[PDB]
Symmetry: D2
Subunit: 297 residues, 4 copies
């Protein structure tokens, strides 16, 4: 009973290094036999491709069979821009964006089409919010919209532009976080807002794309990624610790765990699953109180 993706091709948007969920999903898909295409934010491109060439991610490339994951092709991408006429002189002129081309959503998709003709799986793993450290009460309109634009609408855009080249019976997957449904202080700047939109859009697009092209659309509501800090300071480290203490099962979350869930979800085994929010968070989401609250000892 294999999760069998041989002969399938995946486009993964949002890989800049070997430390996030994106890399983790690519690894699982690669283990399952899929051919891997990567969309890399174009300010990150250089250092990513360089490190890769120098062998800097080689330990991170190790698959379960001992082989090394191969990235078939890296495509620069900036998912806040749909087509070339949407780019400001401003941005077009910066060194980084100056160095590369075809990085708008419309352009990348046309390149993939030219290069490979089709894809089966679309993975969205990018998010960005300039004011993420501010409470909503202190978030500016511009900051709020930027977060929505890069973290929610970018999925709509990707799907929409790639759909014509996706083979029916294919699928997409995005990553979400509980802050959309529950109050998580510290997840600011409209990022909670953006995750709420992404989840709602997942359901709507499951209908639109399911009926239109027989494509499945789901999202994974993941917990904090990694092991405990010696001294937790900062949002993430703090949530890692919180989760470890308070989840129904006491353990940390590994990239593996998220990547394997994704692999299953974009595979044919998951043929009856669509418009779904799958919790891959050690069951934290189900808890009604914090076990470590001082009231309880």
């Amino acid at each position: 009973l294999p999760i069998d993706l041989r002969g399938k091709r995946a486009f993964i948007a949002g890989i800049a290094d070997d430390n996030g969920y994106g890399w983790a999903v690519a690894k699982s898909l690669a283990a399952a036999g899929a051919e891997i295409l990567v969309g890399t934010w174009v300010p990150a491109l250089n250092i990513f491709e360089t490190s890769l060439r120098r062998g800097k991610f080689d330990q991170s490339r190790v698959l379960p069979d001992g082989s090394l994951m191969e990235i078939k092709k890296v495509y620069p991408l900036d998912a806040v821009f749909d087509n070339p006429e949407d780019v400001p002189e401003d941005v077009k002129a910066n060194k980084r964006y100056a160095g590369s081309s075809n990085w708008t959503v419309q352009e990348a998709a046309e390149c993939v089409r030219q290069d490979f003709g089709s894809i089966d799986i679309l993975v969205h793993s990018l998010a960005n919010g300039p004011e993420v450290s501010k409470p909503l009460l202190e978030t500016s309109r511009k900051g709020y919209l930027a977060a929505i634009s890069a973290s929610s609408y970018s999925f709509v855009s990707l799907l929409s532009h790639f759909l014509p080249i996706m083979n029916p019976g294919g699928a997409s997957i995005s990553l979400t976080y509980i802050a959309s449904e529950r109050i998580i202080p510290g997840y600011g700047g409209g990022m909670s807002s953006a995750k709420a939109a992404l989840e709602s859009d997942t359901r709507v697009l499951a209908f639109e794309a399911g009926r239109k092209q027989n494509i499945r659309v789901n999202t994974i509501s993941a917990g904090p990624l990694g092991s405990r800090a010696a001294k937790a300071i900062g949002f993430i480290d703090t949530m890692i610790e919180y989760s470890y203490n308070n989840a129904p099962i006491q353990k940390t979350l590994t990239a593996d765990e998220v990547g394997n869930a994704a692999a299953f979800l974009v595979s044919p085994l998951a043929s009856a699953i669509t418009g779904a929010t799958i919790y891959v968070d050690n069951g934290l989401n189900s808890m009604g109180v914090a076990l470590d609250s001082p009231v309880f000892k």
Copy 2:
């Protein structure tokens, strides 16, 4: 056991006529004894104030005691603009916006402050989406963001700017729709996305403003407003009919019904209710199938 708002002052954003939820909430609040301030979109200002002066809304102004609702003051407002420096030459120059002033969120709030010094209740009843008739797959980034900007962020802005002049123990209320949580075909253009953000923001702001100033924050997920069309054609009319046939209780929804729920929710009787999504939709939301599906007869 009265819902007693005597001595309290309400600012209602989103009233352009006597046909929407906004007017309905104002009427209930007025019946309860609140003093009514209105924020009117500034392209609508003229015709609104004129009709009001001509007595065109007099039948609609009738309260339960036979008296007529009084609007203490109408303030022009355009809630997609926070301060004056955010307005484009473009918009500032149009006849309509040219005719009035202090219509940015920052300006209206400062005016209310000058005029009355304080408010107790904030009602958000405005929404707007240029591409509402398009499926997500066909919605542009600009159209999607516009909907978010006018329908979600406008609440954050209002709350944030008014908070300093809200008396503790006061409250706010917004209006939402099920499309945020479930698939409703035809509710396009990112309006479903925007309602999802608004709901998520309600919870977050209940925390932020509750802790900061002891202000309650809730939203009402309302159904389609009005009685059945002779021939339902168009989104709304069609949903009216759908709901009537398929809700647990077979009836239409009246403005009354939404306005009374709101009045209760912003009153002191509701002192233990905050961050909540209250369904005022004849229980449609709870149904798992459509009773009128041809499979069932």
Copy 3:
């Protein structure tokens, strides 16, 4: 804008003293003008009626207008028994049950019918679980079923037996707790199970009774009732403290607050609300983490 219940009659199941939610709802309804009938567990009957006669609840009977609530009639009731033939020699023979009569659901309802002919409002406020202090893993079948029987099915029974004498446009209300949807350690013995059934039944009965007799059916998911203990020890006291520290709004919950929500919900103002779970818990339910977790300071 009154919540006006004059001329309406309420039957409140589950009042044994002046300390629970039941008493609180009766008080609100009474303030609103309803005529109050009470269903008292028959092992509690004596001490309840005695205290009442001695004036022991007089301070608790004080309504907002300074007047004293009147209980029109107290009916003994044991809601785990539907009709007389369901009672065991066992129970029929005990002193307490021996002392009174017509205490089965079928019998009480027939008495109310004989006495008053009709009712408008039904309040369910009884729960009982022999093994509530045990984890599920340690709960016996008998203990689990007992909890379901007294805390869930008793509502089905009451509604079903009273429905024929309820005036259309009337309503019912029950009390629930978050343990149904989220993990609350310490709420054992199948009581969480029972609250989950009660909530699900609320929705189903909103459909059944709404279509059948135009009766609204809702439930209130309340938080822990009362102020903080000097030294919180025991489930309730501990949750009181937890909630106070961790809710979006920092305060305790008073009976008042629950009773006022109920009064609104069974009134004509709430005519578009049915099959609903209304959170009256200071917004605790919306929180995604405990603010007092040691990880956060």
Copy 4:
């Protein structure tokens, strides 16, 4: 990327033939390499074992590799009875129950222990409700409790009795249905109530068993199983048709699809998933209206 269950042993409660979800899960687990133990209702035992011996299920035993699934051992079981002293003379005396032994939960578990020493996976796939065709308003207490007893508490009992012999890092899975959360007319007799309890218990037991023994606990909310009837008449056939017309993806549901989801969920790949309700229903659950409602054409 295999879903690898080699060396693992599963106990599947609720297999009486090759037509339900139970058989479907057994097949997937078997494909993944697990060793299969079956718990068969003891009135069904005979015909099940006979058919199996005659080769009547041989076509249904076909796995993806062309091999035939092997059932290592069939154990009679009646999950409404925990131990022998709970059985009535009544039942003990019937021909069927007379023919076999060790069929109480306590007894089967002790037998498995004796036979194999341990298990890794527990599957619950049994449900039963004497009054399933009646509305709640017409369901008797006895009928309601029977449904709860066989469909909810039976999972608590199984888990509790087997836990001591489950290897840490093992898992359990049950089957649920949307009627728990939404109104599904026709799913009567307290079966909706029972599914609500089962779901709530899943979360609670994920906490109890996760902390106690590092066991994962999840449930699958499945849709109607099978292809369309020539003439849909009867609950199931009707829901099959409803779902096909109205799900985001237009297709039927196959046993396969449910079995594969289960296999994944009880495997080590799903190590970060617990207390979860996974929808395997072609995304029906996400829809906010029926597409086939006559209002929409």
